[PDB]
Design a protein around this ligand. Structure first.
Ligand SMILES: Nc1ccccc1C(=O)OP(=O)(O)OC[C@H]1O[C@@H](n2cnc3c(N)ncnc32)[C@H](O)[C@@H]1O
Length: 390
């Protein structure tokens, strides 16, 4: 194929560079402001990292995290975003698993025993992460994108021993198109608010990629989402699309009036949406679309479609995806009402784990991802979660 760079591709999308992309602490950054900052930061990272070097970002959601992530990709580095409050041994184990060359952490955090840089105290709108003092200020017109095969590993997503899922340019644009375009039909200018953070694959797509992919903007909050905080954000930001999980919508019941004010598309992932929650908000005039995603598949690959959602259901495979149920002998289940393990194949499929044993990599056997989830399929074709396999 043609060598390409995921960041460069996103920067090339023909969206108004003067429109917002990220929101943070009441402020706003446009596509142009972030593009310029990313290129500048890339000139600094290229002095520190070579193509292929791994980077672990133990940071909460912020524009500097999204920009640093994309700056790593710009130079050919392979970044991963993990829980900033990860325990020392957990962060060390992840950095060891991907043999990271660089770890970026919050302020005052201890050192790992790879190179450790810390973010600045005060939560600035754009942080240099001490790169100015380390490698000097940035170059003014940087554009030395490292272009590689679209199927090559571009970044990692970590989910017992941690497993790092490889994601490439191809299957990244794949799961963005399938979900952000074909399922949600996100429009330029849409205000997005994802409560799950960017160290969760769910949140990375919601907050990091979709604003660039679809021309929308996302609210980034580096504090933990207490229902009180979630409320302040809703009131101040008034998002049109809300990415939550079942428990989040349960916690939002007493604030239904405030949520209905702006939210028009409410999505739920992570675990099955109970009928009670779907029906509580349906009577308030809000449809919650339940969809399943998996780190190994990029994002949601099977979901209820807006305007056609049903209670106690995960919907249908997204366009381009194929879903199959297998019995205890690995044989395809052709019938309805028979629960089996769900296999999935499609645009978002990851090319595999970064480091793993043959038994772990076997989850990708045959060109499918074995979710380990028990699913059944009714006559209409809709899937319903039934639990996990033993
Ligand atoms: N990474 C993601 C991106 C987008 C959206 C979700 C994710 C995400 O959750 O990624 P993970 O790798 O952490 O977990 C995947 C596993 O979580 C479970 N699950 C997720 N969503 C649902 C759902 N709607 N209904 C029922 N079960 C669900 C299921 O066991 C699955 O195997």
């Amino acid at each position: 194929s043609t060598l390409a760079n995921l960041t460069e591709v996103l920067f090339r999308l023909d969206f108004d560079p003067d429109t917002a992309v990220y929101h943070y602490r009441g402020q706003t950054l446009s596509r142009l402001q972030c593009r310029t900052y990313i290129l500048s930061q890339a000139s600094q990272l290229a002095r520190l990292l070579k193509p292929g070097d791994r980077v672990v970002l133990a940071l909460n959601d912020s524009p500097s995290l999204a920009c640093l992530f994309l700056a790593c990709i710009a130079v050919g580095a392979i970044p991963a975003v993990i829980n900033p409050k990860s325990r020392e041994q957990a962060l060390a184990d992840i950095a060891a698993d991907c043999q990271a060359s660089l770890v970026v952490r919050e302020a005052d955090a201890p050192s790992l025993s790879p190179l450790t840089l810390r973010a600045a105290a005060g939560r600035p709108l754009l942080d240099d992460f001490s790169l100015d003092a380390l490698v000097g200020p940035a170059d003014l017109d940087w554009s030395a994108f490292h272009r590689q095969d679209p199927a090559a590993a571009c970044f990692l997503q970590y989910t017992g021993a941690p497993k790092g899922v490889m994601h490439s340019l191809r299957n990244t644009l794949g799961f963005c198109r399938a979900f952000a375009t074909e399922l949600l039909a996100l429009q330029a200018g849409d205000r997005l608010y994802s409560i799950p953070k960017m160290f969760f694959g769910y949140g990375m797509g919601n907050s990091l990629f979709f604003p660039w992919f679809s021309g929308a903007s996302a609210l980034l909050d580096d504090t933990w989402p207490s229902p009180e905080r979630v409320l302040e954000n809703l009131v101040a930001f008034r998002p049109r699309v809300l990415f939550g999980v079942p428990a989040i919508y349960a916690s939002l019941r007493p604030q239904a009036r405030e949520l209905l004010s702006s939210v028009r598309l409410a999505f739920s992932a992570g675990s099955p949406l109970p009928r009670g929650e779907f029906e509580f908000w349906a009577a308030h005039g809000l449809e919650i679309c339940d969809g399943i995603g998996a780190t190994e598949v990029g994002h949601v690959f099977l979901a209820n479609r807006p305007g056609q959602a049903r209670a106690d259901s995960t919907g249908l495979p997204l366009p381009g995806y194929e879903c199959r149920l297998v019995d205890r002998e690995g044989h395809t289940i052709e019938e309805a009402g028979r629960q089996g393990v769900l296999l999935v194949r499609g645009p978002g499929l990851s090319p595999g784990y970064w480091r793993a044993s043959e038994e772990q990599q076997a989850r990708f056997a045959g060109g499918w991802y074995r979710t380990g989830d028990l699913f059944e399929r009714d006559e209409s074709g809709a899937y319903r979660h039934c639990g996990r396999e033993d």
